[model samples]
Target chain A: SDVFHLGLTKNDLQGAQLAIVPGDPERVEKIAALMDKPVKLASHREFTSWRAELDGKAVIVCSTGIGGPSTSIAVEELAQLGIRTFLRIGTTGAIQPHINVGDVLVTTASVRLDGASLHFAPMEFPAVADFACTTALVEAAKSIGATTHVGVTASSDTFYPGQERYDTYSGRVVRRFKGSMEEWQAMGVMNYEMESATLLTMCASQGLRAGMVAGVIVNRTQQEIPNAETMKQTESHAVKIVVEAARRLL
Target chain B: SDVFHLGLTKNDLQGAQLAIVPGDPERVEKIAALMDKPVKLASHREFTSWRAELDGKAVIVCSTGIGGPSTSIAVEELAQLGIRTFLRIGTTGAIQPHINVGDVLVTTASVRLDGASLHFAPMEFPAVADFACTTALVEAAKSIGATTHVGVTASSDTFYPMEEWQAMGVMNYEMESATLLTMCASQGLRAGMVAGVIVNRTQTESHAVKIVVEAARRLL
Candidate 1:
C-alpha cells in the first residue's frame, strides 16, 4: 500500500517526519549526503529517492520532477508514508532586480498560477510556507552564510510563456500573459519556479508543514541566464541550507 | 482554451463582464432562471454553470462548489474568459442574537479566518468587499423590502464554530466570502455578498438569490 509511483514504502520511511523535495532527480543523493549514512531507497520514473538520518532520526530526500502534477503526487505519497513536514529546494529565475543569480530566496508565499493545486483547493487558497519551516530556512541560510532574500515567489506550469518568456518553440507568449513578469516584479515577487504552488497548497490542504527555498539561476530583469556550471555552487548553498534546516528542526 | 472544467467558452459567454457565484452547483440554474432566458452552459466536477441576460446584457451564474479552493477556481477560469465582477449569494447562520433566521446579511468585510485567503495577501491585508457592490447590495435589499443587516462576517475554511468572533461583533459566519473578498481585493476585481440567514450561531440559502439577482442589475 505504501508503494506506488514513488516506489517507496513504510519500512523505507521509518516514520520520518520531514522530507526534502528537490526538482532534479540527480540532486537527491547530494542532499542526503549532507546527512548521516545516506542510502538510495528507490529510483523510479522522475523520482530518485534517498533515505538518510538527521540527529539519529529518519529524513527523506526525493526528486519531484518539474511541475505541479508530479509534485502533488509526490507529496501525497510522502504524506501517506508518514512524512509530515515538506520542504522544497530548487532553482528559480528571479523576476525582481533585487535578486541576483546564485542568491537563495526563502518563499513566504506563492502566486498560485500552477493549476494543479486547484484540484485540491482554489486559486484563492494562499500557498504559504509553514512559519516554523520558514524560520528554519531563514536561520539555516544565515548559518550557512548564503546571500538570502525572503519574500513572495510565483509558481507556474509553464517555464516559458507562463513566466512571460517569448523564447518558446513558437517564439510567442500568449496575449493574456504578456508583461506578466513585470507585473510580478512590481508586486515584489522575487523568483519563478514550477513546483512551490502545488507543494505548499497540498501541504496546507492536508494539514502538513511545508516551506520552499530556491537558488536563483536566472535573473529575468537583468536578462542574465547563467550556465548551470556557474550556478552549481549556488545549488550547494541551497542544499546546505535545507540540510542544516532539517538539523535545526530535529 | 475557452472550455475546460466549467465547460464554458468565451463564445459561450458572449462577453459577460459580471458573474453571480453561489457555493451550490444545483443553485446555478435557479439564479440563472431569475435572469433572461437562462441556458445551462455545462457541468463538471463541483462546477455547474449557466448563462443569461441581465440589464439586457449577458451575465453568468456559476456554482463554486463550496469553500475557498473551488470558488477560487471558478473565479480564475471565469476571469480568464473575461468575467470580472463576482457577487456571491448564499445562506449563512446568524451569530448576533439580534439577527434572525430568514433575514439577509450584506457582508462589508470579513475576518480572514479562512486559511485560503492568506495565499493572496498576508494576514495584515484586510478582507474587505468593494464599495460599489456593497452599496448596491444594501440599496437592492432596501428597495426590494427585505430585512437586511450590514456588517462583518467571520469566514473559515473549516466550519464548526468560533465564539470569540461573535464576542467581537461578527454578525454571521460563512465559508466562502473571506476568500472571495480577499481574492477580489488582491486582484482589483469587484466582490460583494448577500446571504439569507437560515439559522442562528447558525446556517448556508433562501431569498439570497433574488436579492443578489436584483443587485446584479445595479452593477451594470
Candidate 2:
C-alpha cells in the first residue's frame, strides 16, 4: 500500500529501480527533462513525482522539500513503493576555500548534524554515502569534464541560524555560531546543505543505496556569492552529473 | 513584506505576544474555540492561522504540520512577525506505563531526536521548555483537576522509527516539540508544550485538548 502523506501507490513507480530526489518541487521537471518520455505521476503536499526512461532504464524523479523531516518521509514512502537506488541532486554552499562556486561535490559521507537521522540511529551512527553510487557519481563527473569534490557535507535544518548565517533579529551572533564554520572546516567538511545526512542515514538503515551530487552555489569560506546566471549554469552541470551517474550505475 | 512560505505579515497577528501551536490544521480552530471571538487570520500550505482573545489577552493559534521541518518554518515565520511566546498543544503516545491515555504530560525538555532542531543548535544543546511556561501548564492542569505528569518527551521526525525511544527511558513520543523548544531558545523566545496521551503502543485514546485548552486559558 502507498503511504498517506505521499498519496502514491506502488503501481505509480512500478518497475522503477532508480529515483532522483531534489529538495525543490520545481527541480523535478528539470531532472525529468534529461530523460526520455517523462510523464507526471502525482503531485500532493511537498511531493511532486515524475517517471521517465533514461538509457532504457526506468527512473523516477521526486522532490523531498527542504529539510530532513520532509526528506525522511519521501525516502520511507518511496522505499515502500519499490525504489531501490536514490540519488539526491541539489545545491549546497561550499565550506572549504579550495572549492569554488559552480563545482560539483559528490558526498562521501555527511556529518549527522541533522535531527531526523537520530530518530533512526544514535548520534554515533555514520551517514555514509553508498560506495558504489558515490564512485559512479565521481566517474560520471570526471567523464563529463565537470570539476568535482568528494568529501563530507554538513547538513543542517535551518537555512540561517543553523548554518551560523546572520539572523534577521538584531544581527546577533551566538558563541556556537562564531566557531561552527571554523570547526567544520577543521574537520574537513566540504560543503553545507539540508537533506543529505537524512537521506544517507535512512537509506543505509533500510538497506537501500543512496548518494548525493550537489552544485556549489556559494563558497562561504571565500565570501563569494554566485550570481543568478552562475547558479543556473552550475545547477545544470550538477543535474547532468547525476543523470550520467545514474546511467553508469545501470 | 509577507514571509515567503507562511504568507503572513505583522498585521495578521496584531497585539499578540503568545501563540498556541498545534500539529493539525483543524486543531487550530478547536484550540481557538476555547477563546473569545476567534478570527481566522491566514491559511497557506500546511500553516493555518487564527487570532483570539483569552482572559483579555490576545493570542494566535497556528498549525505546524507533523514534523520538525514544518514546525521550524512556522516558528521562524511567526517570530519574524513579532509573535514571541509559543505553547504547543498536541497528542502524544505515552511510553511510560504509568502515564495512561488522557493524562496530560507537561514537557520539561525533549530529546532532540528530530532533524529540524539540530539545524538550530548542536546536539548537546538542550531543547528545554521555558521553565515559567512549563510551570504554568502544570499549575493550570492541577487547578483544573486534570491528571498531569511532568517529564521529558522524545520528539521524532518520523512517527514510526522513533517509537524506539520507549526503551530509552523516554516518557512520551511526539513530533514538533523538540524543534519548537530549540528554535525558541536560540531566538530568546518562550516555549512550552502539553500533550495528551493518545497511543500507548497497544491502545489509543485522546483527551489532551481539554487539558491543553484549560492550560492555555489559565496562561492568559
Candidate 3:
C-alpha cells in the first residue's frame, strides 16, 4: 500500500535494501555524498529519499525530520517500501562530561523516554539496537580513529523541556526539571537525541535490524558548545563511521 | 523569535486569552460557528485558526492535526502568541466497555503513552487537565443533559497500537491530550479536553457533534 504521508510508491525505492536515517532533511545529501552514484529519489513533507551505493551495496538515505512522530512515519513508510536495515546517523547532546563535542556515541540501547516507541511496544519493552549492527559500528569507529562512546541514549520528544533544557519559552528553567537530567546521568545515559529509541524499538518489533551513531554537538554536563567548524568536522566523521559500519553489515 | 513550524505572528493571535484546540482542520469552523461573529484568522499547514466571541469572551479555535508532534507545535506556538487557556474538542475511541459510543469523556488526566509530551515532562509527571477548565466542561455537559464520564484517557502516538491501552487502565484513547496536558503543566497554561466517542471497539453506534459544542459554549 502506498503510504499517504510520505507520498512514496514502492517503485520509488527500487533496489534499496539498506537505509540510513538522519533527522534533518538537509543531511540527506550529506550522507549520500559518501556513496557512489547517489540519485535523488523523492522529497515530500519532511521526508527526502535518496538511493546510492555504499561499497557496491545499494543503500537509501531518508530524512526523518525532528521527533519520534515524524521518525516513526518515515520508518514505517520505508519499511513498507522494502528497507530491511536502518541506521540512524544524526547529532546528539552528550550528558556525560568525558563525552565531548566532536565525539561519536554508538547507541547500544536507549531509554524509552520517547512517546512514539510506546505506541509500538509497552514501556517495559527494551529499545535495544541490533547487536550485530552496533558491534560493526563500534569496530568501524575504532578503525577510523573517531572518539566513540557506546551505551544508552535518551531519546526525548521535545528539544527543550523534554531534554531538561531551559524553556525556549522564557529561558526560564522548571525547578523539577533538573532532577531528571541528574537521574539520567546517574543511570549512565551517554547522550540525548530525539529519534533512536523509536527507531530501535520499532525495528525490534518488526524483526528488522536498526542502530544509531550520533555526533555529539553539545556536552550538557560540561556546558560545552561546539563551534560551526567543529560541528561540520564531527558530523562528517559520524557519516564516515556509519558508512563503514553499513558496509561491514553487508 | 518567530516560530518556524506554525508560521504565525504574535500579532495574529493578539487579544485571545483562551483557545479551543480540535484535532481536525474541518472541525475548526464547526466549533467556531458556536460562537458569535466568528472570523477566520490564519491557515497554515495543518493549523487553521479562527477567532470568535464565546459568551462575550474572546476565544480562538485552532486545529492541531492528528497527533502529539503537531499538537505540541500548536500549543507551543499558540502559547507564544498569548493564548493562555486551551480546551481540546475532538473525537475519541472509547476503550472501556462501560463507556458507550457517543458519550463524552471529560479527561481528568491521561496516560502518557504519547511521544511528544515526554519531551516536555518526565514520565512520572502526571498529565493532568486543569481543574477549573475540567469542572466547567462537566458542568456544561450536565447543563445540556449530555451523558458524560470523567476519567483518564490514554493519549497515544499511533491509532492501532493504542487499542492495547484499555488493558493498562485507560478509559479511552485519543492522540493529543497527554502531550497537551503535560506541556501545559510545564508551561503554566490551563488545558482540558472533552472528546466524543466515535469508536467503542465493541459497540457499533456513533453520535452527533452538538455535545462538544455545548460544552465549549459553557466553558465561556
iRMS per model in Å: 10.3, 3.0, 3.9
Q: Write the per-residue lDDT of candidate 1 for residues B56-150, one digit (tens) a residue.
A: 89999989987898888999899988887999988767877889887889876676777788778655344666656877798788887888887
Candidate 3 C-alpha error for residue A231, in Å: 2.8
Name the better of 1 and 2 by TM-score.
2
Candidate order (TM-score): 2, 3, 1
- Kindly list the per-residue Cα lDDT of model 2 for residues B1-220, writing each as its tens digit: 5785677788877678788888777788888887788999887656789999877777899888657877877887788788778888887677777777778888899998676675566788899998878887888778767788888898777767544666766788777888899888877998989887776765522345555656666566
lDDT of each: 0.80, 0.81, 0.79
Best candidate according to TM-score: 2
Predicted model with the maximum lDDT:
2
Where is model 1 more than 4 Å wrong at Cα?
A: A223-229, B1-220
User: Each model's TM-score?
Assistant: 0.57, 0.77, 0.70
Displacement of residue A38 (Cα, Å) in model 1 is 0.6
**Deviation in Å, model 2, residue A241 alpha carbon:** 3.7
> Each predicted complex: what DockQ?
0.03, 0.32, 0.23
For model 3, the stretches where C-alpha displacement exceeds 4 angstroms are A119-125, A142-145, A166-178, B2-66, B73-81, B87-154, B162-172, B185-187, B192-220
Relative to the unseen true structure, what is the C-alpha lDDT of residue B24 in candidate 3, on a scale of 0 to 100?
66
